Design a protein around this ligand. Sequence first.
Ligand SMILES: [Mg+2]
Ligand SMILES: [Mg+2]
Ligand SMILES: [Mg+2]
Ligand SMILES: [Mg+2]
Ligand SMILES: [Mg+2]
Ligand SMILES: [Mg+2]
Ligand SMILES: [Mg+2]
Ligand SMILES: [Mg+2]
Ligand SMILES: [Mg+2]
Ligand SMILES: [Mg+2]
Ligand SMILES: [Mg+2]
Ligand SMILES: [Mg+2]
Ligand SMILES: [Mg+2]
Ligand SMILES: [Mg+2]
Ligand SMILES: [Mg+2]
Ligand SMILES: [Mg+2]
Ligand SMILES: [Mg+2]
Ligand SMILES: [Mg+2]
Lengths: 123, 97, 332
Amino acid sequence: IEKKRCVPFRKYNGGVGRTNQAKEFNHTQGRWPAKSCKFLLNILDNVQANAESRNLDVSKLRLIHVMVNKARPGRRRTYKAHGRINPFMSSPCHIQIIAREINKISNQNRLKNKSVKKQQTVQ
Amino acid sequence: KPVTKFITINLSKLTHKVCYKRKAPRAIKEIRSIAGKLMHTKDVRLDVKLNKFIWSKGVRNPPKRVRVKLERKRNEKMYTIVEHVMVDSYKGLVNEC
Amino acid sequence: KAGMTHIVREVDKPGSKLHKKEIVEACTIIECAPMVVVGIVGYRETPKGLRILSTVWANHVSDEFRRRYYKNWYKSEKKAFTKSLNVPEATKNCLLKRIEKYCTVLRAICHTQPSKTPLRMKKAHIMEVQINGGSMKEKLEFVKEMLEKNLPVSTVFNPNEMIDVISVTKGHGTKGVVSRYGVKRLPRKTHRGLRKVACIGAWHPARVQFQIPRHGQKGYFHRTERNKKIYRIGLKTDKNSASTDADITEKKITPMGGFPHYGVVNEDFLLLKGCVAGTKKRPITLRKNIVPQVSRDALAQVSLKFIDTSSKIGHGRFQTSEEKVKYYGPLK
RNA sequence: CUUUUUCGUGAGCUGAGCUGUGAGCUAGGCAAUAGUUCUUUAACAACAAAAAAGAGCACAAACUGUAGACGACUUUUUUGCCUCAGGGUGCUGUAAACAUGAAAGUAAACUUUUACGAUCUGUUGAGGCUUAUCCCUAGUGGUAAAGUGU
RNA sequence: AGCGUACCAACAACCGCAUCAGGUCUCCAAGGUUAACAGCCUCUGGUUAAAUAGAAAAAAGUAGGUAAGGGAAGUCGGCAAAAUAGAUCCGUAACUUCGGGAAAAGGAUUGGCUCUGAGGACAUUAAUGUUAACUCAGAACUGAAACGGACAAGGGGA
Ligand SMILES: [Mg+2]
Ligand SMILES: [Mg+2]
Ligand SMILES: [Mg+2]
Ligand SMILES: [Mg+2]
Ligand SMILES: [Mg+2]
Ligand SMILES: [Mg+2]
Ligand SMILES: [Mg+2]
Ligand SMILES: [Mg+2]
Ligand SMILES: [Mg+2]
Ligand SMILES: [Mg+2]
Ligand SMILES: [Mg+2]
Ligand SMILES: [Mg+2]
Ligand SMILES: [Mg+2]
Ligand SMILES: [Mg+2]
Ligand SMILES: [Mg+2]
Ligand SMILES: [Mg+2]
Ligand SMILES: [Mg+2]
Ligand SMILES: [Mg+2]
């Protein structure tokens, strides 16, 4: 949020600018999205609060599941030349998180004879 | 800990690049940044008389030099107050503590 | 590179319109503090190109030579060139005998001394200087005598010599076709603007060829220029290093008020006729001609009548700072 | 595996001879077996657990501008650097104030006195400005935060 | 007697698919400069708002400003841009339906300061006294030769 470290953009990156702070991750493109970070921090505080009720020690929790899905979009309009109207949609999402404590043959007598003979022939 | 400093800042060195409609706000912004960077504080307050003095010739040409007094106070446990010092000659002034 | 100035010179060309006239010419000034010799490298010839046997270092090196191996020297332990200087000299002499027996080319590693300039940089520049001359053994003997001494610039070149120059031009960024290639400018009626090339190519070679001029970066290019003549090799032990036979005023090369954007020159320097690529402070490399020239201009020797040292800030009017106070008398 | 055994070659001994290693001469005693073949499991290179031993940098930050759309590039981080100031070199063209100083003329008391006046003169080659990409000065004050990869 | 009476009137309340740089009838109207309800600056009243902000500052674009020497050689073509312009005093041809052409073409002047002259009304009697408004014509002095100093404002001819 404060623009000390960045987020590498590896998938949806068409036109994203190149940044100094992306050498940390072995990449060339990065950005600082603040709204995403606030929304994710709210859920992380919820996870920690729920993990303090049941008696777990926060120092050992590892993020084993992070999943993001897209939700039903909202609807608005915009006005174009020559009397036309086109959509102006939005793009909401779902999120879910899980944290978890982390510590740290066949006899075949004919085959037995063959094995014995092979072992003898190599001595 | 608390400390006072007296400095002079020449603004013509800092408003050299911006156009007419930006010359005074640029000086205000530069003064705030300089005081914050010198006192290691993020919360810097500017007295209203200094703002009045910076704008006294319109948006187009602020004064060339200004003498200010910086004070760091104990209140994000710390902050800085910036005031204006009226002088009639800048010729001998250096910065002190 | 320090800056430029002008001189007055008499001509000795029988048959020209200028045969007995004093004329003005423009010159460039290069600061030439001495270098230091610190190493030896030997090459041998193979069907894949020249190849190295070994590198031999001197017994001691300086800190500005060691800084060139570090991105950030101020926060280091400074352990470069600390274990490999205690090597016994017997091994060094065995390696030198091998170099003598198997090699064909010698070069010497030398570095500059930025502390004697007005520069902000402290890393020294390192380069290799090839040594031509007699046999391989004589070459090795010649080099070993200098492994920890200084080269003055006057050892390498002579007065009135012809020299080649290597440097990097000034940078300008992205520049358009009109400025980058000097194409024609297009009529004022044009709809999408006029500063471009109209036709990129014919229809059916169905591509753009590499010969067509396009926009892109201009400046900061590598160049090698020939035939720059030496007019004077001045020293730092000399007080009147910018005076002549016809002008006995005691003077140094630096103009009144400092060389603009550079500083003051208080080492020994070269005076070159003409111009050289690069900005002020740009490092300049100086090579001898590939084969020596015997033309009428390469051998002719020059005698100077005046060197200008008036101010280059504004429009200078005096040659020394005492004339200025002598002209005005006492002030307020 | 025993028997009588000669010639060469090195961990230690000093091109004495012991060891170790290889090649032989002389006389002996003592093996192999899985019901007719189903690849003759045989090479080279790795890795892991147990057994004896050899034990620093870079990125980020602040600074620079010889660089620049952004990345990239050129630099410095305590004899350095940044900021102010003093000097230097230049640009413009003589500041504000005072003057029983000048000024074509005017008007009004009883020689002189007073009042109004574009402009000019003296103090005054004065006053103002000068790196933000000018030059010099261990002159003054400062020089923070301590994160990431290996 | 009965009916209307809030509010907007575009700047987001109306029509244009919309909180659209468009369209849409009437009345009131200060000071300075000036011929002027023009342009520019101001007082009463109104506002400091616009489907966004910060930094950086290269190509290229859009709306502008300059350029030594030459002066249409550019181009189908002087397209675009420059040059002129207010007022006072002089001087104006061919041709002509005698009314014009005509601001034809052309030439000179213009600030500031200190002065001189001209143009009325009224009451005691030719004489005395009081008392205004605005224009016009001359002279001396003065300045880095400038003065319709910004705004405003014809290019001309065969
Ligand atoms: Mg639209
Ligand atoms: Mg419509
Ligand atoms: Mg067109
Ligand atoms: Mg110059
Ligand atoms: Mg005065
Ligand atoms: Mg600087
Ligand atoms: Mg009403
Ligand atoms: Mg409708
Ligand atoms: Mg719209
Ligand atoms: Mg509207
Ligand atoms: Mg533009
Ligand atoms: Mg101009
Ligand atoms: Mg021209
Ligand atoms: Mg033509
Ligand atoms: Mg033509
Ligand atoms: Mg035509
Ligand atoms: Mg036109
Ligand atoms: Mg006519």
